Structure formats: C-alpha cells, structure tokens
Amino acid sequence: SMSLIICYYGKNGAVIGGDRRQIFFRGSEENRKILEEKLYSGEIKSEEELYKLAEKLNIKIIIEDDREKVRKISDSVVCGEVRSLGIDAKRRRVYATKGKCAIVDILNDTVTNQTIKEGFGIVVLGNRFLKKKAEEELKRTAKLFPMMPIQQIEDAIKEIFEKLKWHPTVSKEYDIYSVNKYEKNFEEVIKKDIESLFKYREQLRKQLIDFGKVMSIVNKIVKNGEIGVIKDGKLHLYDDYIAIDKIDPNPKVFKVVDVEGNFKDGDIVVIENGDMKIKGTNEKVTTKYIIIHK
C-alpha cells in the first residue's frame, strides 16, 4: 500500500527512492477505512498506536516489508510503483531516465492514464501525510537538483527518507537508485515492463480458472444415478455421464470405463449415495475412474 516514492529526473539523470512496506488489514470494511484515514492523515504516529487502535476496531494487521517498490531496470531506467490490491488491482508506476519521466496508471489489466514528462522535475507518490512532508522537505533542495551531482541528489533523497521513516507506513529499509544515461527507447522499455505485468496477471488468472475447473469437477461427482450398461466387461456410460482418470483441471475423459465385480453384459450400473453397484443384483462395482455429471 501507499508509503512514499520520490523520483527525480533531469538533465543529469534520474534518481528514485522508495521503501518496501505493505499493510494488510483483515476485518470490517468500515473499520478498515477508519484505520486507513488516521494512518494516512498523520494522526497515527507509530506502530504501537497503529496496533492499539486496530485491536480496538477488531482489525488484524499484517505488515510485510519484502515488497521492493522501486527498481533499477538498467543503466538508463529506474522505476517505482504504488499499488492497492483489493477487489481491483490499482497501480501507479513511475519510470524515469535522464531528462524524462513517465507515470502510468493501471486498473487491473487496463492502462487508464499515462503521463510523459521531459525536462526536469520531481514526482512524489504516497499517502497524503508523507507526500506533503516530502514535498515540504523537498522545497529546500529541489531547486538545486539540476545543478547537483547525482550522488548529492541521492543524499538529499535519503535524508528525506531518514527524516520520515519513523512513520509506520514506511519500512525499516528503503532503496535508492540512480541512473545517468539516456534511454533511447524509453517508451518501449515501459511497454515491455507493462506487458510483463499483464503476462503475470494472465498466469494468475489461469491458475484461478484451473482451480475453478477442479472445484467444478468435484461438485459434479455423481452421488446418485443410473449411469450406464455393462458390455465387454466395461461400463458404457449414458449420455449424461462421463468418466475421468483423476481430479485435475483438464483430465482424460472416458465414455467407456473399466470396471470390476460380479456382473454380466446388459447389467445396468447405478450409484446410490456414492456407492456404485449393479441395478437389481445390488452387487458391488469398483473402478479406478471417477464418474461425473456431463
């Protein structure tokens, strides 16, 4: 979630800093909201205040600080991201190279806004409180950045992260990266990075689709039915039914199923309460396969 990213771009290069902290809340949507407002307004000054207020509101907190939010893609490009994963996956990414910066907004699998900037400036992403304080701290050095060596800008940005990291939306560790080369294919590099996000999301989607196929197979298992007729020692299933070799997202399907037991050709196979037997005789029918409704 929203902590702090600070990004400079100018003729001397680009510099980005960001922390790593994510906070997950579990509990009522309304109390969640109350907690976030106080967290992002500056009312909540420490972790102890946060944990205390959360327990009073019946919200469980999970803080995870393994989220790298800024990266260095190459000699010429740095980037950062803020995001909110809820019902919707909301992201705002900043990319920067010497002399240029881009901001891209993404809702789920759609780019909803983009901004490209050339010249020099600063982009601050994060919560209101930290955004404002960083901007306030920045107004004292930001004018000087275009005339500074890169290391001094790094330092100026570190200083701001040192001054603000007491805040509980910030991790203990933060990352600073800079580049001093111009990326000639800036837009392509951004495009490729964004496509990777979409590929990754399409993979998660496939995993969830597969889970749903499996659950759907499990709910379709036959507990009751007249399912077919014995022929050549095999169960020839009726149209409403099919067999599968195992519970899997895309299993081998069978209409004609190897079975064992005391029956003969023309005997009708039934299942009642999940017990497979011969109609009339009531003799037991075993199989390796799983029978499901079409």
In a domain, 253, yes or no: yes
Q: Clarify whether residues 259 and 143 are in a common domain.
A: no
Reduce the secondary structure of 1-54 to three states and give it as a string: CCCEEEEEEECCEEEEEEECCEEEEECCHHHHHHHHHHHHHCCCCCHHHHHHHH
Could you give the CA distance from residue 137 to residue 212 in angstroms, rounded to a whole number? 50
Name the β-bridge partners of 114: 104
Is 56 part of any domain?
A: no
- Elucidation technique: X-ray
**CA dist., res. 51 & res. 47, Å (int):** 6
Q: How many domains does the chain have?
A: 2
Q: How many residues does the chain have?
A: 294
d(Cα 143, Cα 233) in Å, to the nearest integer? 87
Can you read off the two tokens belonging to residue 23? 């906070």
Dihedral, CA of residue 23, residue 28, residue 33 and residue 38, to nearest 10: -70
288 in the same domain as 145: no
Q: Kindly state whether residue 36 falls inside one of the protein's structural domains.
A: no
Cα 114 from Cα 19, distance rounded (Å): 23
Looking at the DSSP bridge assignments, the partners of residue 79 are: 71, 95
Environment class of 43 (CB within 10 Å of its CB; exposed 0-12, middle 13-18, buried 19+): exposed
Q: Both 203 and 141 in a single domain?
A: yes
Within a domain: 27: no
Of the residues 210, 234, 255, the one at which a domain ends = 210
Name residue 234's amino acid: K
| Domain limit, last residue, from 164, 190, 210 | 210
Regarding whether 195 and 273 lie in a shared domain, the answer is no
Instruction: Look at residue 34 and tell me if it is in a domain.
Output: no
Do 194 and 228 fall within a single domain?
no
The verdict on 11 and 140 lying in the same domain is yes
Q: What is the DSSP letter of 145?
A: G
Which residues are CB-neighbours of 13 under 8 A, at least 6 positions away? 98, 150, 178, 179, 180, 181
Tell me, yes or no, whether 55 lies in a domain: no
**Residue 150 in contact with residue 180, Cβ under 8 Å?**
yes
Domain residue limits at 259: 220-293
Q: Identify whether residues 186 and 249 lie together within a single domain.
A: no
User: Domain check: are 202 and 238 in the same one?
Assistant: no
Decide: 145 and 120 in contact? Cβ < 8 Å.
yes
